[PDB]
Amino acid sequence: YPDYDDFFTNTVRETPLSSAPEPKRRFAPSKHEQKRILQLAYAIRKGRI
Amino acid sequence: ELLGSDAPLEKVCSALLEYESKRKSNLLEDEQDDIEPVWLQLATLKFIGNNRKLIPYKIAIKNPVIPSSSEACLIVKDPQRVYKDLVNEAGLSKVVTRVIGLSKLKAKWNSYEQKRQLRDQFDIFLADDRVIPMLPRILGKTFYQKSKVPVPVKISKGTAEQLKREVVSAYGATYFNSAPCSSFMIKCGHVSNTSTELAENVESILQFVSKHIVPDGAKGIASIHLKTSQSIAIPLWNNPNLKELIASSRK
């Protein structure tokens, strides 16, 4: 039962783990909701809602 | 002349400027045109203030004491988009750098560190007349003790030309914060001002002081001195009737 050995996490990694580029969805309004909004607007036009 | 039936001005301030210039004595990179300010001292025969009125006196002056390059933060009652649009419409962006709504000022700047950061970002803090009373809180002693007191700019109707007029008047006027005391110091300008300009500033300030600060004006005035942040308080004028005025008042 040796004491916990932090041979790896004893230091802080300064950079994020991923180097992938940031997409533009995270800076623009949501497209799922805009799709949902247009579907709701359709149902309001047709009297379903 | 309003002082004691005489105006011992001109010569006194020219001498002060000559003293200020003559006692001149790495290299630094963040330089400014900052010069020693001109401080007019004034002693009264009674405490002109019942309590510190944390609202400055817009003493209109013809030689502005605030440098024209000073950035202004405008504190307005919410909404904030309205007066941001008005400032952009009137072309005050180089002058009114930032417009802050009152609630946004109450929320986003709550820490003293945040209050200090905001305070040092700007040189003058203009504030809408109908939100001045709120500002003693939300700002505290970080502003009202560290020489950053909001100025009451009157923009109630809120149109481009009044905003420009109020701002230029705001820069053109000096400010004094009335506090309970017999002696108080008022800024007349900086050494860069000429002897005539400072004297014009002195007489205009004394005219405002006699009416709105000292209830009995010159009769209430005891003595006047001219000074900078370091120099001697050069006596501009002393009361010629104070011998009988003190006896009459103190009885």
């Binding site: 996490t9 247009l38 309001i44 | -």
Partner: protein, 82 residues
């Protein structure tokens, strides 16, 4: 208690509240028609792990009784590493 006081200011909108907001926008689009980014707490194990690895998390709150403990047994060390 203080942590949950901050958390409760950033609860995600309920499905009913989300529906109400989206219908409100749908009516404007239908009749006559710019928004700010939402603010809420982040949840889901995979999503939070990606946020820690991206160094975007400001505060991680790990449940103390996750039954398969392997799900979060690595989390404190990962948070320590990041």
């Amino acid at each position: 208690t203080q942590v949950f006081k901050l958390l409760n200011k950033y609860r995600p909108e309920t499905a009913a509240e989300k529906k109400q907001r989206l219908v409100a926008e749908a009516e404007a689009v239908a009749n006559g028609k710019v928004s700010k980014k939402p603010y809420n707490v982040k949840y889901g194990l995979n999503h939070v792990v990606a946020l820690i690895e991206a160094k975007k998390a400001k505060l991680v709150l790990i449940a103390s009784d996750v039954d398969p403990i392997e799900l979060v047994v690595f989390l404190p060390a990962l948070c320590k590493k990041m």
